[PDB]
């Protein structure tokens, strides 16, 4: 177990076939988690549950570029909850980043940032109790 706010180091970037596993839980009154694959200053990929905006749930994922966020692409499709245990993977592929929750696919979002191999930090924030972060091939 670890302390949040947390750096992951992504040496050399990240690659396709590249399993990215965070482990934790969701801490009682959550109001956010983060999760920020940096280039950089740049975020290539922020993935935002947020538990309360205008009292509905909502995933959140941009890219900041130049120290502006772009384009936002939403889900309402929500598998967190307050309190409890999670797993979120997040699978580099060709095209895009595919992450799964509670061995459930959530998402995918296409890359913006076409530099894989300089996205050397994955930053985890938020309302979290962080059990572990790690990653592997598949
Ligand atoms: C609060 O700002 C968030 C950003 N954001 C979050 C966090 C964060 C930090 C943690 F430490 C943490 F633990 C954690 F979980 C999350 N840091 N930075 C991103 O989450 C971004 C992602 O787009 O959104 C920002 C956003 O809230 N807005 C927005 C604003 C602009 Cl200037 C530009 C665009 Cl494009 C959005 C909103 C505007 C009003 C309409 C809705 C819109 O969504």
Redesign the pocket.
């Known amino acids: 177990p670890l302390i949040?706010?947390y750096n992951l180091p992504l040496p050399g970037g990240v690659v396709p076939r590249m399993l990215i596993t965070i482990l934790g839980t969701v801490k009682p009154n959550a109001?956010?988690?983060?999760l920020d694959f940096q280039r950089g200053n740049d975020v290539a990929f922020?993935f935002?549950?947020?538990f309360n905006?205008n009292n509905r749930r909502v995933i959140?994922?941009?890219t900041?570029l130049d120290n502006?966020?772009?384009?936002?692409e939403r889900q309402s499709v929500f598998p967190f909850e307050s309190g409890k245990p999670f797993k979120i993977q997040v699978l580099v592929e060709p095209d895009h980043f595919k992450v799964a929750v509670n061995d459930a696919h959530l998402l995918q979002y296409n890359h913006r940032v076409k530099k894989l191999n300089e996205i050397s930090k994955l930053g985890i924030?938020?309302?979290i109790d962080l059990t572990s972060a790690s990653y592997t091939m598949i």
């Not at 109001?31 to 983060?34: D, K, L, S, V, W």
């Not at 502006?68 to 936002?72: A, F, I, M, S």
Request: hydrophobic share 20%; aromatic share 4%; charged share 30%.
């Open positions: 949040v706010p109001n956010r988690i983060a922020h935002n549950p947020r905006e959140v994922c941009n900041k502006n966020w772009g384009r936002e924030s938020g309302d």
